[PDB]
Amino acid sequence: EMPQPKTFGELKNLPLLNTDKPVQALMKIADELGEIFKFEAPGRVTRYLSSQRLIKEACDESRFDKNLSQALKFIRDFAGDGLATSWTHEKNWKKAHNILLPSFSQQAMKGYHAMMVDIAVQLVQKWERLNADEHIEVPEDMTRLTLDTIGLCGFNYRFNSFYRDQPHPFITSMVRALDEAMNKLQRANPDDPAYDENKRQFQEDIKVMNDLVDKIIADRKASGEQSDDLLTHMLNGKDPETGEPLDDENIRYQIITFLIAGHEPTSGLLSFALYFLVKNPHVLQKAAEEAARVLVDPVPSYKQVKQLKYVGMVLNEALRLWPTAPAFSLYAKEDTVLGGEYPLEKGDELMVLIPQLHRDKTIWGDDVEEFRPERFENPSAIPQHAFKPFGNGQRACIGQQFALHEATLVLGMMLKHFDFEDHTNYELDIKETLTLKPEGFVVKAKSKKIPL
Template sequence: MTAPSQQGSVSTIPTIPGSRFLGNLSDMRTDRLGFFLRLSRECGPIARFQIGKRAVIVLSAAEYVHTVLVEQAANFEKTIQVRANLGPLLGNGLLTSENEFHRRQRKLVAPAFQHRRVAAYAEIMARYTEEQIAGWADGSTLDIAHEMMRLTLRIVGKTLFDADVLQEADDLGAALTTALQWANGRFATIIRTPANWPTRANRRFRAAQGRLDATVYRMIEERRRSGEDRGDLLSMLLAARDEDDGSFMTDQQVRDEAMTLFLAGHETTANALAWTLYSLNGETAVVARLQAEADEVLAGRTPTFEDLARLPYALQVFKEGLRLYPPAPMISRQAQAAFTLGEYHFPAGTVVVISPYVLHRQPAYFSDPERFDPERWTMTNEASLPRQAYMPFGGGPRICIGNHFAMMEGQLILATLIQRLNLRLLPGQKIVPEPIVTLRPRGAICMAVERHGVMHAGTGSRETLPATSV
């Protein structure tokens, strides 16, 4: 570790030395999450790393994170790299847009995620979960990460766009993976080839983008042609008018917002559920308590929105999965003006990185941080946390607009699964997190299905239900 020698100078912020010309590029490419954990542990709450000659600041204290994302949010925008690398996929949607345009678009999209509408989505979430797991035969083996992607993709298609994408789920999932891997590769390089150059990687990305666009533009065209207002997100986007000139959004603008929410609306929850189910392996007492809660509250029936308040432990378990494996493991911002944090003064243009993955593993906030412990999320324990110590969906004015949607979806799916079956991790696998924009597992998470039936109210007995074709 390099110790500071001149107070206030960015060049003296503690760092882990890298190569002379490439800086810490190799560390970022080989084990990005491990490198950020090392920076926090060896260099403290304000650390620095190099990509080539450019210094990047890493924050791992909740108070500094709160300053950047909340108190001084207006001074910090998405970085040029985020817009350049995700822009070809997401266009100028909520994730990449800035300033007044972002505020206007967020205000436009917000009604789709109001409490009243989110509550109405619960029935679809639970019903689609029942339909999917009905096809899982007792003793069969499946990739739970893939299954959760298929399920949440179908849910977001129906709830936000009133479209059933079940038959396209595998194709769309593969296309999203290709597109995200392309974007991730561009983050971990100094010299990026233009996206329109005919390289092999760019050609694969364009093919994946074309597959995704085909579905999104088809939904837009069909809705425009029908003229229906179905009260969903897509209808809201198509009906929106500019406050100044009264014009409607173009198909490109609708596509950008739809693509952003299509991606974020399923990718984050799918990953969080897969990691939560993975984390439950070996947690016999946690699983038993989850099942007891589901048996008592549901007694074999499909959960509803009204049941959520009576399923608090399912929510605690999901929150703990989000703590250990936050969907967005890294958040970056670029300062528009000079600022001060702690004893250091930073110039305009400084890039700041915040890693929820690292923040959620700080012993100052979470004792024995690598341990899976849903008791951290009792009301008393959660209330004792500093602001921004837990931020699975970001923070401040740019917090994920669908965070309540995702939390409800995760709680409902978990409760539905747990009362029907157990999922046992197959031995011999090395499950490694891979931060490709979102935090996916590298490869499959193979699990064996053990159907245990459902508890009948008043009898205390279970009936094992066979798998069916859906």
Template sequence: MVAQTAQVRTSLRGPKSRFFIGNLPEFNGDSIKFMLENRQYGDLTRFFFGPFPVLVINSPELSHEVLMDSLTKWSKPALTLAVLEPIIGNGLFTSEGDFWKRQRKLVQPAFHSKRIGEYGQVMADYSNDLAKEWAGAIGQERAIEKDMTHLTMRIIAKTLFDADVTVEASEVGETIREALALVEEGFRQLFPPPKWMPTKHNRRMKRAVARLDKLIQGFIDARRASNEDKGDFLSLLLQARDEDDNSQMTDKQVRDEAMTLFGAGHETTSVTMTWTWYLLSQHPEVAAKLHEELDLVLAGRLPTLADLHNLPYTDMVIKEAMRLYPAAWSVTRMPNEDVNLDGYLAKKGQIAFINVIGMHHDPRFFPQPKKFMPERFAPEHEKNVPKYAYLPFGGGPRVCIGNSFAMMEARLILATLAQRFAPEVAPGFEVYPDRQFTLKPKYGMKMVIRER
């Protein structure tokens, strides 16, 4: 806990802003640059989203305070919830209070290590399918971000619905991505039109949501009819019982949780892997060390779950990629009441950004922050990283429920593909990080497939 200062600050430092539009043009223009530059104003700063003051938190201590108080004094911003609700309903990501607590308890067992361990085979096998495709595309350019999305979507569809990329599962993926792109458009507007207004944006969103509802309900109906335990997330959601009153989830709750896991569970990992390939292509010395580890431990065979603890460098590469390019570039919160934060009175309802990408690039916590150095995450160094300065999965009670799943998936994908391939950025192709819903390369990631 940060000590509460008796003296109350009435203003905070931050970038110069203009009347009414505030800092909106810079924030919407190049948000990543904007967030990286924000650190210069201090540990707690502000900028103006149009006329509205927004807080930015740049220190591990304050991040810890806000994230740990996320069930009491702070919650997710009303705007985020309103924008996401039509797609993922009242699932884990968007729910609050006692309802969230109950759902988290019901869903958590699905992520127990033994349970997710069973998914390791799927992750390695599906990565190997992509390896076969790449083997037939040596010297060719591929949109790596699409390859990664297709792969992580296949994995989540199989582990969630036991669906091999059926038409339905890919349609869920496509539609969720379309809906999230619409959400992102909404976030950039100062005054988004109300949902009832038949604007082009609202009509597209309505259509996407209707399609998603139909598809997911199809999976639920089929599973209820067969009454089979397929060992996937869906069976677990349908069987889960509240230990207090023995109640189960309604179809609507199962739909919301399934949609949440599908939405949160593939785009983030896909983006992380895309950046990892990019970084490896720019740092041959890191790639060489990774290849050495993979050759030594796997000697050309597919990795299994049991191999992962013998692949520490693979793990370090992914952690360092998530430091430089965190898929969730910020975590947002809002106070439920006026809160004294480091001597500043944060107003009820005011949006606060935990500047994840800013802290990940702060030389106080990561010396030579621009350098891609997986060694930072070697056990003897990782312990020196201040807690809450590195937040790729958030923190506190609302920390990402899928973090072990994601790390296992990322390591198995990398171990399978990097054994044989070393993609290179296509000549002349521009790579630029951009805030979409996640931190993505603005123009995608065109790479030439090369054999090692």
């Protein structure tokens, strides 16, 4: 009874994801098959959920817990039992959860703001300093910004991305390791000697990341500056339940986890937000008007960022259309029936296909493809589990407020400081990595010539 997309013999559905854009492939499948489809691969089955109707059940934490998708399982080879790749039942998940949640308290957020502004100003300055007719490589610069922000705010580490015309080596290795991790989904015989080089490159890339992590830790140890940041909590915070701090190994995984998680989807969000803004000039103008009205100081204060309501709406609407961490996986904690209709056995896996959730016309109306920030004029109007860019429940994104604050600040500053032109009439082309990004999205920015 459950729809299932086309199969490939013994490979079952797995070749469907042998594409550069698997999330978009799954969205198309969802478009065809509806709110739920079974997806089989050799030795694996999951069910992709796309309707709020079913996802609200899936989001019942008494019935389902976070599952490590194959992607996360393979990413776990270097993210280990960091927060994102740990099972809820692993001691280190709840420990690190409890230890690191304070890093995203309101007070923490205020504390990050200055460094977020530091990086944002670097972005603005970069764009201010472009010559006539030069253009902005949007995902690239958003990723420079987000990486630097998480590095600086989180770890008091400067990736100095705006000093580089190429991504920081960490990124290069992180991108290749993520990609290798996700390529393993397709690999029938992962121990085939043909993948020895992939294994070597994987370890080399993991070593690059870990070397940077070791440097972040050593620099913090050696530091004479007082820090009270995410790393501080990693190195010193004690879990109230266990009384225990994170052990060294987990700290390292958390650093890797947060460097990755703390920058990748946010960069996508910013990129998509700017994409949608330049595609929707009335929206852009409204957002710009808000930025101009609110950001009355040379650098935004924390409170001003919080007053960028419409910018927040823009970001939420971008997350609605292109949630940059576009899926998460769940497993049935016990036998349960989904939707009154689909019996699941304990351990059965679900995938929540967030972009498709966000296109559930029964929630959003028929105009789901339109970019309408006003959908979020009162976010509380959105039904529960209808809008899930940050995942669910206690396994939701710990960094959501950081992401949104950063993105609101940055977008606000961008909108305050520049007019943007979609000079190429850019054709959305969504590159799928760990996140989604509008690949090749370029704009031209005309400074409003507002000093910092």
